[model samples]
Target: VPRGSHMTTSERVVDLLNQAALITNDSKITVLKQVQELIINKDPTLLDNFLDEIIAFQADKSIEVRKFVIGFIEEACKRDIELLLKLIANLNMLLRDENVNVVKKAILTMTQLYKVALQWMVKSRVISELQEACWDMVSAMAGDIILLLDSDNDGIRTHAIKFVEGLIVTLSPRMADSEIPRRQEHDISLDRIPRDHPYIQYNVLWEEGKAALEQLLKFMVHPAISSINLTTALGSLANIARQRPMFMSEVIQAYETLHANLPPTLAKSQVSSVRKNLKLHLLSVLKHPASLEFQAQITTLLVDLGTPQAEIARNMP
Candidate 1:
């Protein structure tokens, strides 16, 4: 069903798997494993061809087949990031493709990949990679995606608004680099809103595309972004805060001030949604960035929130 007449081992395996699963015999599962092992051992054509075709498949007129192919590749990308990253340039290119489905699925795929990568970075404290992946993805699709935020397709429009909004909330105004820990390893690239970038800086709003992304988040009362998973983004920052209370105190106080003073007011009914979204967003921030200072601030806040009393959430004191 890969539509490609050629059968890469990866392709044949997809064909074989259904038949294998259909076999009423449990013993066949082992045979399937042996077949899988042979492919792994053979080191034949890697998964990239299947990977690309899977990404490219849904665009054809084959209506029923699109969902099936998406499932095929979605699982593939999740199970195998080495292959997924290989699709980054390809997937990024697809974001601008004229075909709407191609663009949508590609961006969706990147988001899933980012969720996985983001979790890894936060855990390992790979701040640098997190920044870069985020930056790269945004810069790649910022304009096209933004234009589609209000697309007639309600699903597309809703998600577009959310994704764009997240691109905003995920931002942090540059703190004194000295205020946070020194990152000797791992990177997460941030989108730079010009000094005029209002969404982040709050001093001025840059109307330019990327700045608008930040502004989009800022102007809304809460949960300005839909696609970002705000929960548990904390792991990276929390790992640091768990040790560094002092640093966390200053950081949290600063954001609380910023979040509180932000000038947006949703209609009364939207207030609850906004509040919940903002809390989720802040929770993510509080969880990453472990350091002496960060831990201290977290300690202060946890007390305010009813976390159990303990020595210090900061560094081993």
Candidate 2:
């Protein structure tokens, strides 16, 4: 029955949920005020019971309530993820509702859950609920992306692209971690997964771990219209191609295959994404200077890519 500034434990959460209907950054800020205090206190038992209560409301028909709960969970995740994983298990059934709106937001929330889950794993924690949650979300997208790649469904294709992009940015190593590959727990058994293990497969999204560079090379040089004729196809190819040269050589064999097989129209489609970024873009100019295309656009870009911009490309530029 605590009121005003001295509100009791449950009262603060109820206050946050009730006022969550008008959520904005300000609302999140206010909730964070209370949440930040609670988390820094690190009361594991209280935290566990609190999240259990939150998850019990998963069946609430109002999407607003669920959205607020998601935000609360996300904010508090860095504090006590065990509770969050438990909540994920309790709310797993929300994914099966026939309603599209609920399904869409649920998947997004689940992705955020996966992002936090990985952090917990990196700390050597057990991750049963979240592992299944991650598999569920990525599996669902795999089916949807495969359909969109084959079908003419524009809306579904767009969602697939966003999901793939989020999958990359969130899963990428933190800025603090070393960029170099140091071998750790190798997945001797299939129970563990390698990151980036080929995603654009026809039937299922491929496993995590660096995807097969050879298959990606095939996509880059895909001579026939059969493989990459549509937006979903382009979306899938773009994700892998944009990675660092270390994961696999960028624009070498892939570039050669592309130059040999790509139609002029297809080449143009890649300009915004590739031509300007790849080293070959401008270097192709200087090597074959006096060529009209080189003199006009490509060399200028290469020169600009030098000095004030990027020293890494100076030799090629």
Candidate 3:
């Protein structure tokens, strides 16, 4: 029998199934810990054997058990592409899971598995439908993706925004000056994903990306959303504009639509902050030479707010 940290391979598998059999509502985490232990031991075959049992827990009465199963499956899928795709296919409803914690865990899990897919492509020197995997994961949650930004937790706020930014960059990746490198990968602090992975590509980028952007822009001037978070979202839009200049027209249209329907005048403070940041950043883009195409429309919007047309033109970069 293996003891302490040196469990022999066969011994660990025995311990794993034994612990798995003991799992019940009361012993859920006890089982979860063992599952994580199996992942640590790098035993995907045994983990694969347990997939049916694991997937069954998504309907468990305990929310914690459901959430743990996701995290455990996320870790297990890291080394197995087939399993990763399988989990991706199985977990769509989890994206909109009524429980916010469940939703958050699902978001993190999908993002993690996509990164693992990218890393495996790099390590094995194989290419498959890489971008579709990540895009499908992201696009599947289009309607609910914005909810994470509303969470009180800062980590959720950051991850939700970054995930949106990554989707945009992946869809419209470009190199302004070929002499300079483009940073195309979506990265978090997680180190398991390979750094040299090939950049992602997508077959279809419109319907879901458009839906997400509309939600994000709507969130931008939302009365309840904080300015700091708006700035983060605006920063993401700015990146989209820079990568795909044509997106500027859609952005201007988004601004036009959102501006006309600004919240009730009673929200003076929120409205003022939004328009102020709006003009500040919008003008910065207008100053750029390429922005001329929509300069008249953007200038009109800014003039209505306060700035004179002459000032807007003179300020052009």
Candidate 4:
């Protein structure tokens, strides 16, 4: 227990955790909120103790307590990156939560943290390290979602798709080439890649391309899949494919296998539209000028999609 008026800062923080634990469930949440507020204010009393203890509360019996603690962790980490690195050490525990929502929240929280790190004063080596760590976390969670892909709850599956889409967007290259000249410069180059170039050095899509695409392909053929989920997967997968040219063959092959038994189906209804959009997305990436070498291959794929023979006589229009 904290000595009413004389305890040192770390001691006080310890007291707070102890007090919160012994209190009623309602009061426990209240005290955890107080602890949360204190850490967000960068309370020197707790210092790292705030993060240390808050992370420790992830397993608190009260859902609210766990929720508030996680919010505090993400908030505190956002305020200080070093704290986030420490938070990362403990974040995988959050992903392991029995509640899929909490796991989803942790995924979003980690992605948000990475977004901030991308814009901050991160070091090249640190960014490279984070790249690997972040991919591991995201992919692990992705695997979990896939394991739960057949859940009866559409909400769970929808949340899973959203997480994948969000991660892909997070790793996407910054759109404006105009910012090319403004990339963070370092005194010493690490791996001949700029640190802040949005995964230029560690292309998550390219590095993890094989497994990720296969997973998405498997989902497309799932019986319970929805158009929204299909589009989300295809769109994000398309973005990744656009960034990594070598995977074009694997993607095209997957497409061929996907449609091997069917020919030239038009969008007659909702489900049919999904098939149409999926094919269009595949073609969108493959028809790019760089894919000209595969033009003949592309033409065959397009024909499978029902493009008229006479129309295929001309180049992609």
Candidate 5:
């Protein structure tokens, strides 16, 4: 029989495992991709068994394979969140992986998985002991990821910036329809679920998210911030402001502060790009219906940043 033509999904999974084990890293990646397609697209029911077989790759010697394993775990968890309990230990291990690239990939994956897991918990509203343990472990891993903001590598810091933003957005309350007329489909927040949900502990998560937002605000003005870091931080603030609305004034204040005194380390061109992004994000907030209350401050800062008066007027709501 031609390869994969007549094989059942289980047979294909087993065949892929055999190939993955026998091949070099390059071909191993290919085999893993095949397994991913089989499990995610062809037959999701295979995920349980396939995961048991493939998770050993998490400790594979090749950094590429290790990284691929993390990505695979993320996808699997996304498809079936109950798998989160099974994969939590593996993800936690990858977070401590020796390679910085692997760790970076793991951080990004964890950021996305954290959001998915939280939403699952809130919606399911029936947390088991094992589920609560998984939640605790993942939440602590979030704190560890936050500490990477201080890492020596700029790349790691960049990913950490996103993680912090994801943390805040995931833990915040959902906005009223009046505040944001069209919420994104995947947008999940504490308030979107029942307030009396027993196991998730809404107040604690909310307070931690508030503190993370404060941390992002401080990060925006760090003296040694790179242009990329500053721009990413500004973009995150704008996104949070648009989604949450409650933080619109504070984010606008952050934009105004940065506009007044950009970091001295940025070169002339870098400074120009940073200011361009600042103006772009501020203009975005200015036009948002939720930002009607902050119109004066936003327009004043836009003017200071050299936005043409007519252009700013055109973007206003």
Candidate 6:
């Protein structure tokens, strides 16, 4: 019996689990971190056997532990795609968690997981029944997350804005750009997906992408929009416009409308911040290769915003 002096990896994992079960929240967090390192670095095989024991903590009484488990699941799924089958249900639970912080973390985690899981499904070419079930749950979760855009909590709304941005980018068809390097194998887009791909439906995803973009655009001018929410929405729309040029014209028009009618509730400093971000995003759109058609309109907007002609010319692509 080697005892605690020199234990096998399995014994060490078990010890960590025991320690996590019978400890204060802070210590439990520390022990959980060690367990993560063990599975992610020292012995990845440990994840397969110890996953349940580790994930059980998602139900721990402590909110911090619950939140930490979402991060753990995110990291674990990234390393082992198969873990998604087991982890996604719990993730959905966390998505609707009572605590705003936990829900926000779940939204952020799901954004990344959504992309990875979709890429895995597309690459395998043959989706299993289990994989399809996981996809369905994730699909429902995506819709639920989008609804959170109207959440009363500003932080939750900001995170949902980011989630929608990721959704649009993932589902949009790849752009035709020669300036950028060749697309990587893992990069996913509607164009790469087969028309008859049995598990993944192209029309549904296309519609969802379209609707998601509309929601972001609408939120930019929402009646109850906060300063932070407005800034975040502008940044996400700009990012989406840059990546998917098809929406460039509408996004530019949205920017123009917002600039023309600044929100009445915003304070002087808040209005100033909004103007600064709006100008920054407009310049970003102006410089993108896809903005060639909108260059004249964008330039006019910039000039109206008080940008010098010399500065606008330098930013043009």
lDDT on C-alpha atoms for all candidate structures: 0.44, 0.43, 0.62, 0.57, 0.85, 0.86
Which ranges in model 4 have alpha carbons more than 4 Å from their true place? Answer: 1-19, 42-45, 114-153, 177-200, 203-218, 226-317
Model 1 over residues 57-110: C-alpha lDDT tens digits? 435444333433444444555555445445455555555556566556655654
The reply for model 5, stretches above 4 Å from the true place, is 1-5, 177-183
Q: Write the per-residue lDDT of candidate 5 for residues 1-317, one digit (tens) a residue.
A: 37767779889789778978888756789888988989987899888877877898876899999999999998999899999898988898888888899989999998888888888888885678898898898888999988888888888889999999878877887667224436345667768766677877778888999989988888878899999888989998888888788888789889878988889999999999999999999998888888888888888888888889999989987
lDDT of 3 by residue, 237-286 (tens): 65567555657777777667656766453356766787787777678667
**Higher-TM-score candidate of 2 and 3:** 3
Backbone Cα, N, C clashes tallied per candidate:
44, 10, 0, 0, 0, 0
Best by lDDT: 6
Candidate 6 per-residue C-alpha lDDT over 1-317 given as tens digits, one digit per residue, 9 for 90 to 100: 25755788788888888988789756689899888988877889888899988888888878889888999999999899888998889999999889988999999999889988887887775778998899888888998999999888999999999999989988888677412225534567788778887767888889889998988888888867898999998998888887778888779989988988888889889989989999999998888898889888888889888999999988976
lDDT accuracy of residue 65 in candidate 5: 91
RMSD of 1: 11.3
> lDDT tens string, model 2, 136-204?
644444334333322343343344344444454333332221122233222121122344333222222
Tell me how candidate 5 scores on lDDT. 0.85
List runs of model 1 lying over 4 Å from the truth.
1-44, 49-56, 60-106, 112-138, 148-158, 161-213, 218-270, 273-317
- Report the candidate with higher lDDT, 3 versus 6: 6
Order of candidate numbers by lDDT, starting with the best: 6, 5, 3, 4, 1, 2
Query: Candidate 1: worst 10 consecutive residues by lDDT?
Result: 227-236
TM-score of 1: 0.39
Q: What tens digits encode model 4's per-residue C-alpha lDDT throughout 64-120? A: 666666677677766765565556556768756777667666666654554454344
Clashing pairs in 6: none
lDDT of 1 at 127: 41
TM-score of each: 0.39, 0.47, 0.55, 0.54, 0.92, 0.92
